[PDB]
Amino acid sequence: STIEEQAKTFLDKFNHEAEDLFYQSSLASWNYNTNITEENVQNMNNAGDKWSAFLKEQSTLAQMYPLQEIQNLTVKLQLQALQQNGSSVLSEDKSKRLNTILNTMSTIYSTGKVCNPDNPQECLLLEPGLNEIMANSLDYNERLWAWESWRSEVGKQLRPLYEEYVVLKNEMARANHYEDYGDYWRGDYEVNGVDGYDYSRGQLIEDVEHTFEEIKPLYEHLHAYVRAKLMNAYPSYISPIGCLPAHLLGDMWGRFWTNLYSLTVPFGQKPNIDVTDAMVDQAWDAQRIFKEAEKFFVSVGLPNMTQGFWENSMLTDPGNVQKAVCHPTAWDLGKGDFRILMCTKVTMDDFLTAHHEMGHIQYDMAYAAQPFLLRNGANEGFHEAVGEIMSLSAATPKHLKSIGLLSPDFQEDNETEINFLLKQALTIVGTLPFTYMLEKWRWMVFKGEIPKDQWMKKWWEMKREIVGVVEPVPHDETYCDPASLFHVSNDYSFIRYYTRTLYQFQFQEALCQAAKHEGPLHKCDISNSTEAGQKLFNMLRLGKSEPWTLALENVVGAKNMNVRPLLNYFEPLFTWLKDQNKNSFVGWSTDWSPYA
């Protein structure tokens, strides 16, 4: 047999086993999250250990087939994926210690609990306890206690483990010939050896940096307006030319500013436009919410959900007889088996959340047409973006009027649109500077540009210069404020929230063109456009078979992330924000501190 004939025999034998072992691991994982029991955890851990043991074994054996000696492209793409999924370069000791540090960091973040100085029994977990305070409170010194305690109790437990994690991840990446762990992550977006569609890891830094420059005038104006507003709402505490204190931004980190809507509303005199009331008045339950999300995808030409979907999904909180993990989450288990786990409540938020999650399911179902190792979105940014364009169309007045949640004669005026856009901006453009800077700091840690003795010094310097946000109290190198966020302490890349945000508005604009939308991009609803669904479908089914550069090009007509469709979405708000700021200082001191 040729090497190329031995490679087919190896893949055919690998895929048969993978199909079985992945379904065993996915099904056991779902069963635990739906019903937390000792039996379910044993099953999940074993099924997981077998899957993993099998995949590292098969990744070693794939090196017997030089990829260059493979005419057939689909077996090469697979053998490459299978070569990339291997984990047998790091020493046994360091590999075991690295796992141990991942579990420890994961556990101290999930077990993180802080107790009040004013109450030694007022101990408060992060969810729902400290998140409650950090979403809702208007109490500076209460917000400050939750912010500071979280970082100085949980964060300080992470600093040592995070130093040991950095050195051990850098060893594995360099052992694979990557410059560092951050370079290894930028690997997700690498396209090498496809003429026309190639993309490097440094290309990614430049394109983030370049698109961020174009986003900055909008963030600056959003920042100055949100500040002028936070002044009225904290009159002693906020400088008109300074960064916003980190503890006042509507969550534990300022990752999103969504919860500042009530303080920042451009026209608070316009009534609430939440359709939760109509859902209650029309007696909507979880079935109806998911049944209405199903209809939206059929309107664009995509399939109905499966019998298995309706028979196996868990769309309501099971009660106390059965214990479940209530994070909204779409599952692709293998072997035709798709599901959603969601403790759905009759609210507009959950209605939107369902379209996002069912988006993930549409993606999974389309790329079932690909071989196993290519059942993956074109890059880590794609799934999130496919989710978000769904809620983009569903949240529109046009769509709500069409499904009866908004009266046929709802009157959309500039005030309603500016309110809509300001809300979207707090959530979407707010998170961009946060998301950029956070990854920038890790890129630099891993690269070796930031010494451990200057980790927190540079962290807050970058927060002040890029995010325009300042710490309320000084932090020494005893803290690991970054590790105080789930993604940092649980070893997940974060630039995906930057890329998906540009990809989503590129997607929306292209699909709204196919659907012959008329005016403002923000008003568009792809519902009823089979043409728009086709354009989506064609990328969706590709999975990770083509370069993400091509996949994007198919839908939008361009080979790279582009910021213009995003700036285009919020152009009306930008013009209004600039007029509201015509007397405000736009920009921020990098030195002013609440403790200065």
Binding site: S29, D49, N85, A330, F372, L373, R375, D491
Partner: peptide, 17 residues
């Protein structure tokens, strides 16, 4: 890391395993 993902929510690394 794992060939492909069976969900699109990032879960804590402790149940992982």
């Amino acid at each position: 890391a794992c060939g492909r993902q069976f969900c699109h929510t990032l879960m804590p690394r402790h149940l992982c395993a």
